[PDB]
């Protein structure tokens, strides 16, 4: 019928069974624990023993405790009521609003959608970031990748992409938090209640998003399957409902790391540099479930933390085959102070072809690639020469190229809480010819930084007008200034007579609810009969 935990090694525990062993990728439950604990079996030991992975911390499992079989894979409650809910890996409410108002639980482990039901019709997903929609154009229902180091600006692109595409769609979306910080988790909960994507009250059914959160605090059972828990509710809305759902998964690398933290612990030799031996079927099984079929559409948005901007590690080097549109973030362009710091060379999508979009889109983005590759091949030699002997034919594809690295920049709506400048929702054909102009020489007349953090071709000519005036401004130093006391300025002590009286009490309020109990001077132990005794005094 049921079995017992026989062995605990950190975050993997071993359950023995007396006949009819559970199928692989089923769910187990322990009774008498603090929280409900789900064990997901990964391999059979051989001696009537499954080997598990732990959805929460194992600190507390006694050897021999009762383990029941649910006989079935992990079931999350899918449904239309799940919108506006912050969801766990194992189906829990962690936003503390009752149970999940949904039915028809579904197995979150399945096979990939087959080869026959594959979509090849491609639609350009216009986002609103001038480096995305020109250079690496995303695909509707396709895949969106995001690499970059820790501190280059990956996650602030993701919520910016939510404000771009997940608001102006009307349907449903899903934010799949896989092992990121709670800070960028909790802040996104506030900036979707205020932006009205997630609602509270009796309007829970008109919302647009579910949040599946497997953040960094959980042990790697939960950080390894929150990718699948966020995935299957997106694949539930695809096949049953037909709506296009946007999957915003964060830190796909943390999905592959959470596998790799216990993959050695299940009895496997480490692979290349120390990552997991089975990363191919782990990630390849993850990715090809995220597609768009004949029945519906899933537009995957993937953020990946890469360690120290090195793309030779095999845990992101399997991901490059698995992403059509890739927005590779360079720390160098952020060290230039340019946001978004999207690489003009490393970030290249699959929509970029004149056989689909049109020659007017493909030629300027290729024209961007000529002027920016040669700018990289010349900024090595500009430090030996200083750009003074080039005979005025290589001083044209440089001066525009120093402008075009600023013309990838844009103030963000989600970032204006800490940058001050208001964000732009930029369209496509207005800036393609705008990108085309500064490549051609129509805007050679302008200075350097008028291109920085702007939008259309109207705002670049109007940053120079303000900039040109500001070189005519601050041309005075004499008198009639703020520094005199004649106009409105009080004396220095009459500021001080409006200060509010701040009380200091020196005892700080620390003995009001703290139950200042006593602790034992001698360590308390148990006896063989189990009752509490002090230590029997003998070595």
């Amino acid at each position: 019928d049921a079995g017992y935990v026989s062995q605990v090694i950190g975050p993997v525990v071993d359950v023995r069974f007396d006949g009819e062993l559970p199928s692989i990728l089923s769910s187990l439950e322990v009774e008498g624990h603090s929280v409900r604990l789900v064990l997901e079996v990964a391999q059979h030991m051989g001696d009537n023993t499954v080997r598990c992975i732990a959805m929460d911390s194992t600190d507390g499992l006694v050897r021999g405790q009762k383990v029941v079989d649910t006989g079935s894979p992990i079931k999350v409650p899918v449904g239309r009521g799940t919108l506006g809910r912050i969801m766990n890996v194992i189906g829990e409410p962690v936003d503390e609003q009752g149970p999940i108002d949904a039915a028809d639980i579904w197995s979150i482990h399945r096979e990939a959608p087959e080869f026959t039901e594959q979509s090849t019709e491609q639609e350009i997903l216009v986002t609103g970031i001038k480096v995305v929609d020109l250079l690496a154009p995303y695909q509707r229902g396709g895949k969106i990748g995001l690499f970059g180091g820790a501190g280059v600006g990956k996650t602030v692109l993701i919520m910016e992409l939510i404000n771009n595409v997940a608001k102006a769609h009307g349907g449903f979306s899903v934010f799949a938090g896989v092992g990121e910080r709670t800070r960028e988790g909790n802040d996104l909960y506030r900036e979707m209640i205020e932006s009205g994507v997630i609602k509270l009250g009796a309007e829970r059914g008109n919302s647009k998003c579910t949040l599946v959160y497997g953040q960094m605090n959980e042990p790697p059972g939960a950080r390894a399957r929150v990718a699948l828990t966020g995935l299957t509710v997106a694949e539930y809305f695809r096949d049953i409902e037909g709506q296009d759902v946007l999957l915003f998964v964060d830190n796909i690398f943390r999905f592959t790391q959470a596998n790799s933290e216990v993959s050695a612990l299940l009895g496997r030799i480490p692979s290349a540099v120390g990552y997991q031996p089975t990363l191919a079927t782990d990630l390849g099984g993850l990715q090809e479930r995220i597609t768009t079929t004949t029945k519906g559409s899933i537009t995957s948005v993937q953020a990946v933390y890469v360690p120290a901007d090195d793309l030779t590690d095999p845990a992101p080097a399997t991901t490059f085959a698995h992403l059509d549109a890739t927005t590779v973030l360079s720390r160098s362009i952020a060290e230039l102070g340019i946001y978004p710091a999207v690489d003009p060379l490393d970030s290249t999508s699959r929509m970029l072809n004149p056989n689909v979009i049109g020659a007017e889109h493909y030629n300027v983005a290729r024209g961007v690639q000529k002027v920016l590759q040669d700018y990289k091949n010349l900024q090595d030699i500009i430090a030996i020469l200083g750009m003074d002997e080039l005979s005025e034919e290589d001083k044209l594809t440089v001066a525009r190229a120093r402008k075009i690295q600023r013309f990838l920049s844009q103030p963000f709506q989600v970032a204006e809480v800490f940058t001050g400048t208001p964000g732009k929702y930029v369209d496509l054909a207005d800036t393609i010819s705008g990108f085309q102009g500064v490549l051609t020489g129509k805007y050679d007349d302008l200075p350097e930084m008028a291109f920085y953090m702007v939008g259309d071709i109207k705002e670049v000519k109007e940053k120079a007008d303000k900039m040109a005036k500001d070189i005519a401004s601050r041309k005075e130093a004499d008198n009639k200034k703020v520094s005199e006391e004649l106009k409105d300025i009080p004396s220095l002590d009459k500021l001080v007579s409006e200060i509010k009286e701040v009380v200091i009490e020196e005892d700080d309020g620390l003995e009001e609810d703290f139950k200042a109990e006593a602790l034992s001077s001698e360590t308390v132990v148990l006896n063989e009969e189990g009752k509490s005794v002090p230590l029997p005094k003998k070595n």
């Binding site: 062995q7 911390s57 912050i86 605090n217 790697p220 790391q257 612990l265 120390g274 360590t523």
Partner: protein, 523 residues
């Protein structure tokens, strides 16, 4: 040869019993002739098979869990990290020389608990709750769960409180928060202990001003620091008075591994109490790489599989829940905070080091301290172009916040033109002036070790290089001109800006006049 053949072996098919009648008669005199050589059968207790170096392998113990404190028969405390099939691997707190093959192991049943509370303010324990400061046991304290998971998503709010460090190299250049996880990653002997201790002495001399609801108490976790350095910092905390509002858990390098492994964990167990009861808490997890080496010692004796640099698999999860339990709660649980300082020493410049890539991805902001910048006069040797934060505005002083954009972006161009000094150009009054500006900005932003200067003096001190008042002053003597800018101005204007908090035009008129009223000794 299967288990059904084993269950068929449970059915007796002997067909004769011409031994069992007699071997049952000579069994009991045999076991009672050799009765002295029998240790008793032990079920809910434990007894040691193998012991060595901090990992002791104990037979039996059917009652223990993972993470239950056990007590050996000499009084030594222990911890059950993994539980194998027939035995339980027990990690040993302290020196392990007293344990033999055959000694008793007593289960205490509880999860490991180190005493928490405000009565510990002024005491130095190790990672186990035992006092080393020579002031006896801890009074008005209580035990708490050190293995607790972090506060959830519904429990937190957006951070607002800036957490002034008292350092102009920090508060203007890297915005810190009160619930922000700030990493101090550098080389060895480069000022990492300098930046952390500058924050606490500032937070003590700004603790006797703030009214009960921004009072940031500090716990400084010493992992693997030698015991003279522990007496050094206790001498530093006492001789300014900071020990009144300072707890310090101090795991030396001459202690065992798991006392160093638990000391940041017990270090945050104190500071969760300051978060739970509405106050603000400072935590510094000093030498957090050396705590991870203290993790690597236990596993590689524990027959556990190694990975990158022979560190185990789950070492990301170690530093994750060590730095996720520091937070800023919502209004519904007091509104308390915790702000985090992990210290990671690079292996002389490996940012792709295995511990580094974990802790740079967990934490919110990082502060690079190269050994390059430490000898160019820049002390503390903060790297500006490589240091990022998260929350930006509403994480600095708000009057500083407007002038910080004038400070950061001019520093951004200056780091690009500083390496272009191989030709002697100084062309068109801009390739010299941004060299003339940012060099004085570097000569602005140096300071002294153990000199906590409040932000209200720094919002004036940041104004001296952003405006004029320094456009005729050399690159040699700004470090003795800044103090005369501090001294000769009216000492009442610093209080009213910290009273205001923002650069109003009502106060902007005074701040342009008073810096020409001062006369600079750089000449």
């Amino acid at each position: 040869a299967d288990a059904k053949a084993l269950d068929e072996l449970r059915k007796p098919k002997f067909s004769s019993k011409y031994l069992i009648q007699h071997v049952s008669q000579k069994l009991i005199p045999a076991v009672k002739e050799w009765e002295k050589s029998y240790q008793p059968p032990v079920i809910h207790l434990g007894r040691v098979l193998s012991v060595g170096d901090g990992i002791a392998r104990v037979y039996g113990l059917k009652s223990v869990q993972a993470g239950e404190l056990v007590c050996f028969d000499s009084g030594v405390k222990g911890m059950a990290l993994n539980l194998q099939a027939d035995h339980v691997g027990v990690v040993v707190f302290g020196n392990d020389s007293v344990i033999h093959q055959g000694d008793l192991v007593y289960r205490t049943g509880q999860i490991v608990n180190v005493p928490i509370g405000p009565g510990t303010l002024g005491r130095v324990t190790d990672g186990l709750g035992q006092p080393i400061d020579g002031k006896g046991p801890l009074t008005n304290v209580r035990s708490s769960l050190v293995e607790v998971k972090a506060p959830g998503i519904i429990a937190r709010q957006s951070v607002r409180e800036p957490l002034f460090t008292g350092v102009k190299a920090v508060d203007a250049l890297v915005p810190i928060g009160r619930g922000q996880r700030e990493l101090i990653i550098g080389d060895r002997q480069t000022g990492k202990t300098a930046v952390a201790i500058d924050a606490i002495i500032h937070q003590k001399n700004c603790n006797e001003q703030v009214p009960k609801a921004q009072r940031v108490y500090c716990v400084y976790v010493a992992v693997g620091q030698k015991r003279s350095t522990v007496a050094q910092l206790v001498k530093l905390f006492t001789q300014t008075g900071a020990m009144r509002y300072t707890i310090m858990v101090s795991a030396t390098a001459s202690d065992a591994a798991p006392l160093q492994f638990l000391a940041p964990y017990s270090g945050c167990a104190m500071a969760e109490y300051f978060r739970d009861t509405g106050k603000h808490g400072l935590i510094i997890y000093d030498d957090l790489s050396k705590q991870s080496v203290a993790y690597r010692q236990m596993s590689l004796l524990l027959r556990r599989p190694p990975g990158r640099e022979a560190f185990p698999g789950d070492v990301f999860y170690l530093h994750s829940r060590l730095l996720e339990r520091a937070a800023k709660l919502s209004k519904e649980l007091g509104g308390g905070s915790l702000t985090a300082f992990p210290v990671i020493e690079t292996q002389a410049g490996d940012v792709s080091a295995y511990i580094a890539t974990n802790v740079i991805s967990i934490t919110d902001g990082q502060i690079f301290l190269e050994t390059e910048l430490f000898y160019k006069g820049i002390r503390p040797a903060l790297n500006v172009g490589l240091s990022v934060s998260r929350v930006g505005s509403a994480a600095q002083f708000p009057g500083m916040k407007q002038v910080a954009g004038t400070l950061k972006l001019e520093l951004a161009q200056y780091r690009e033109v500083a390496a272009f000094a191989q030709f002697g150009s100084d062309l068109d009054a801009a390739t010299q002036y941004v060299l003339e500006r940012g060099a004085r900005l570097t000569e602005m932003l140096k300071q002294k070790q153990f000199a906590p200067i409040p932000i209200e003096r720094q919002t004036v001190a940041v104004y001296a290089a952003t405006k004029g008042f320094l456009d005729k002053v050399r690159v040699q003597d700004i470090v003795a001109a800044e103090e005369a800018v501090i001294s000769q101005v009216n000492p009442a204007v610093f209080k009213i800006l910290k009273a205001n908090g923002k650069i109003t035009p009502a106060l902007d008129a005074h701040l342009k006049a008073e810096l020409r009223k001062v006369k600079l000794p750089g000449a």
